[PDB]
Amino acid sequence: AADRADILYNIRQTSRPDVIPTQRDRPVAVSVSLKFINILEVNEITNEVDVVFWQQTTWSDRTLAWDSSHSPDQVSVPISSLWVPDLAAYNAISKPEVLTPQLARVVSDGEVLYMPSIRQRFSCDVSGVDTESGATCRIKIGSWTHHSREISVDPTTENSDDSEYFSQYSRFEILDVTQKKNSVTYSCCPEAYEDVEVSLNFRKKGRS
Amino acid sequence: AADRADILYNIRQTSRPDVIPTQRDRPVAVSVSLKFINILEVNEITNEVDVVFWQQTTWSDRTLAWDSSHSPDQVSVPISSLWVPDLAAYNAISKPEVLTPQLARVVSDGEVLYMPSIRQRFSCDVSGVDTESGATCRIKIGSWTHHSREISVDPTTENSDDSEYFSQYSRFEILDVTQKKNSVTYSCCPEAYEDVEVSLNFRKKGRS
Amino acid sequence: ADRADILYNIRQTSRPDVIPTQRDRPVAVSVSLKFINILEVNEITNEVDVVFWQQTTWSDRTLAWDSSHSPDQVSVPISSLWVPDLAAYNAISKPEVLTPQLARVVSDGEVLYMPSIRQRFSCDVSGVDTESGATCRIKIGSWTHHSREISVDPTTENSDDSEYFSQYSRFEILDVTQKKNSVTYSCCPEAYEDVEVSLNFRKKGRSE
Amino acid sequence: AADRADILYNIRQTSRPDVIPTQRDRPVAVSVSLKFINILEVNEITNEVDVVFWQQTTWSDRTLAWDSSHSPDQVSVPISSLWVPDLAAYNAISKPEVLTPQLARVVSDGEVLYMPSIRQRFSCDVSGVDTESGATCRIKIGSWTHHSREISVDPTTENSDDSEYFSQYSRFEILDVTQKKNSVTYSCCPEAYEDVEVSLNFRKKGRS
Amino acid sequence: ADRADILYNIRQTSRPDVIPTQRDRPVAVSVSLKFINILEVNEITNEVDVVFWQQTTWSDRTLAWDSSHSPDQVSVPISSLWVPDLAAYNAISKPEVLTPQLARVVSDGEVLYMPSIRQRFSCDVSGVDTESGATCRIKIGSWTHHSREISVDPTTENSDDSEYFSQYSRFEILDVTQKKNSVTYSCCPEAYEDVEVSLNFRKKGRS
Ligand SMILES: CN/C(=N\[N+](=O)[O-])NCc1cnc(Cl)s1
């Protein structure tokens, strides 16, 4: 059929990175799930935390679909060639440091999977981080300019070990992670903006 | 009967990011409003503060207008495809750090709203920041190259809560925030440059 | 024509990489540093962090147009026009431009470019804690154009040395003097003109 | 006989930087080998180490091959004109800092070689760094978005000293370096991602 | 042919990614470090923060032009020209060019580039606090071009060492010797020429 070069060419032909792939007249269903990899530099005085994580992002874009009958059903494409959710962490106090090659996976049916590793600083509750019950830091992520009728965010509830990929060499340890969906409204505008809230319950590891 | 692809497309046909959309001979009306999200660093000796805020900027651009009678009346567009006010913080001692996706919301009537979240350090009065009455840090923001006749800056007076969006985990707290208007002239030229004096009356949270 | 046409023509004539040497002779570039602040200062290492507005002027005949029935001046991205390759010889960090990179172009070809710069220099910091104060020398000039291509001369004028100096700074400006110079180097036989700006300052609140 | 220009041009005309050089659906065999050069900023408390190494990377793309009969059999080419494996250090806690020109080396038989010098922080076991047995820091490097069916990583078990290129001025010393191979699956996909695991064994040089 | 014409020409015939090899002979590139300032230093970790002007010269005939009735020198952005792919072999931080990135091109095809660079190296600092001082040796050369493709010779132009060094620094230059050398590895049989810049300095006596 066609080769990976043909698939990419077609993409750049039918893709519109600056236009949201609004299916029918309904918002794009962007799924977000954070995989905590490390917890660095914590300050209980300034309520700040340096965190490394994998932002597993997904959504569909039918304008990139193709017939993978006798050709590959998946390819890696630079995000600059694709439309990407304008996600932002509300309580983030430093721009996200993308530590991995910014490539997205695209399936022939239009399913897009972007999972960059991210290091970033947040302003959250760090209190009790050294107590047995630990602290609970809450990360809010969601579109920055698209409201509920354009983009919906939902956490892909996939029963897994909160610290499955979490470093064993960190001074801290995850106790639990729960991801809830929310929808806030602002005075700037009459519409609401969906967002996912990830609650990181961690603490400093004791001693033998 | 046009979709978002048409809107963005048409926008790029009439948009002149490097040209100021001055209607006839009157200046461009820019509404500026800062929404303090956090106060990270504060130095009583050097009188410097590291702040985080949502700079709500507004202005109209008729050349971007379009009939939305049968299409979305709004779309998010990269600020690189639109002209944007050359606002600057006169007492900033560090370059602005935009923590959010650089997208603007453009309304079918040409209205433009850009609200980036910024972290920036300033030089201002920090004295009394540890007192009951707290400290008052004023931030002067305005066009850097367009004088009063070309660009005008007015605060988006919207009597709301000063700390409505302020972080609760900060070591400081907002006492009050007033945003007035100013018109200062300089040496370079006899033209007067308009600015907005945001007065952030804040103090260190005392409860220990 | 409108401002769109003025900026348009500037894109046709302007050669951002071709020095506007008018009829075989150097280009007259004036430079005036408007010290705004003095941040971190180390006497042990002799290094200082300084914020200032580098007021740069010069003429580019190629840009001149007819302001008979059109705006006399327009702001244009410095990337759309030739700009001096000024450099600070005793600079120890890249020049951090805190303001929008726009220059003021007058219909007669006169160009004004005044960015706010945050930089770290290597200079005599000793005596900063004394009455006479310390004097820091800033040598600025073209990095690749010699005396026959660029002539850098301080915009001498009975201006106020502390006119725009932050009142909230830990230091106070005692005196600012600007001496012009012309040095030759061990690479080329030609002479490179420079401008030395002496910044006399000291700590405030010292025991009298 | 063709010269370097002709050769480069040939590469640009056939090379697909955003397309993996797959040969009949078999995966691209990618070889990795880190030549540690220096170890800096070690922290046994937080288990973080800064490492400087030469990531020797090798793979093939026979579509770029040419007849070096009477013409150069090798040329340097900007990696932006070539397809480069999207390798990533899974345990890195800082984006890679490339300290050298980003040029590759293409050989007349389609073999491509890229060896950038990198400085990067990692989260690994550091306990024992000040002991005779030293510490063992395992670094995992492998394709970030291409699974084993698309890319395969294999450590060149070539004979060479461990601290051969290692700085003698480093506060540490390499006791031994062993490169293994892995293939992990993730909650995203059923396919596996091959990665080379380098185990560095070093200890604080004790001049006693 | 005025400057606009010159630049146009250069920018139109310059192949930034194609090494300008004259016939079969390698490209003769000259390297000269002019230490402008020695910042932070650490004898414990053997690391120094140096500032130096990297004088780099070479030729590219393809850029030549008759300067009889026109200028014989123009400033051109290095991004428009092919530039030697030098790298400090023992650098532990990427080079911070603090000056405009422009080269000087003479009508004969001669190219001169001297950026001011601040960079951190890993080298011998032991004795920096003594009368003898320390000798930090910096090796610079091509990264991908071997001896047959590129050659680096330190401009033997007898000049002063601390000539442009900063007087306000905390250290002082005792001596500097640019020695040409060669380097080979177990990857490739070919050798890569480089320049060893021996920096002999010590802390200035506090008094
Ligand atoms: C997600 N939070 C927002 N506002 N808020 O006040 O929080 N969104 C509205 C916009 C932000 N930037 C543009 Cl343009 S419209």
Ligand SMILES: CN/C(=N\[N+](=O)[O-])NCc1cnc(Cl)s1
């Ligand atoms: C804010 N201070 C100014 N002048 N001043 O003399 O203080 N602004 C005018 C300009 C700044 N940059 C250009 Cl170009 S015109």
Ligand SMILES: CN/C(=N\[N+](=O)[O-])NCc1cnc(Cl)s1
């Ligand atoms: C400031 N020191 C110079 N030479 N020197 O020998 O010290 N400048 C001349 C040049 C700098 N870059 C080019 Cl190209 S020509």
Ligand SMILES: CN/C(=N\[N+](=O)[O-])NCc1cnc(Cl)s1
């Ligand atoms: C300067 N040291 C080199 N190798 N070495 O093993 O030390 N150079 C060869 C190459 C550098 N980058 C590519 Cl691609 S080939």
Ligand SMILES: CN/C(=N\[N+](=O)[O-])NCc1cnc(Cl)s1
């Ligand atoms: C390293 N962890 C991964 N998945 N996971 O679910 O943990 N990697 C697979 C991918 C990474 N980026 C894209 Cl796109 S697919």
